[PDB]
């Protein structure tokens, strides 16, 4: 338990995912969802992803001045489905917590598959 504290911050990422998929702090998501509505009102297209990474990145700098220091922005991304472009465009957008190495020891495949479902409601 002390090697994660020196290098990886394992249980710090337990508190961290609650702010995004469980929506702990609302200012990260309200300044998101304000900027996210002019894109969700139109149906999704092929060109839907490249603006959503830019609208994610300019939403996390209007609310932060110290969050560049941890290793959380590189372990969260935008997750989107395979739904055909004839939808309303609101249900395609979701955020997911990415894992690469020793964080994937405590996070297997079954964890974030359930976190998609608790996110959509």
């Amino acid at each position: 338990l002390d090697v994660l504290n020196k290098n990886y911050n394992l249980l710090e990422h337990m508190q961290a995912m609650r702010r995004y998929l469980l929506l702990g702090q609302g200012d990260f998501i309200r300044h998101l969802m304000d900027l996210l509505k002019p894109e969700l009102v139109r149906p999704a297209t092929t060109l839907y992803q490249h603006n959503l990474t830019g609208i994610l990145e300019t939403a996390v700098r209007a609310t932060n001045a110290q969050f560049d220091n941890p290793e959380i922005l590189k372990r969260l991304d935008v997750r989107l489905l395979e739904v055909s472009p004839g939808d309303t465009g609101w249900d395609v957008f979701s955020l997911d917590y990415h894992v690469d190495g020793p964080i994937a020891t405590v996070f297997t495949r079954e964890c974030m598959s359930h976190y998609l479902r608790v996110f959509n409601f």
Binding site: N9, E12, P70
Partner: peptide
């Protein structure tokens, strides 16, 4: 909130 390192009430030594 504690960022960069663990949530702690006292950092001693190398941390």
């Amino acid at each position: 909130v504690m960022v960069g390192m663990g949530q702690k009430d006292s950092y001693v030594g190398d941390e």
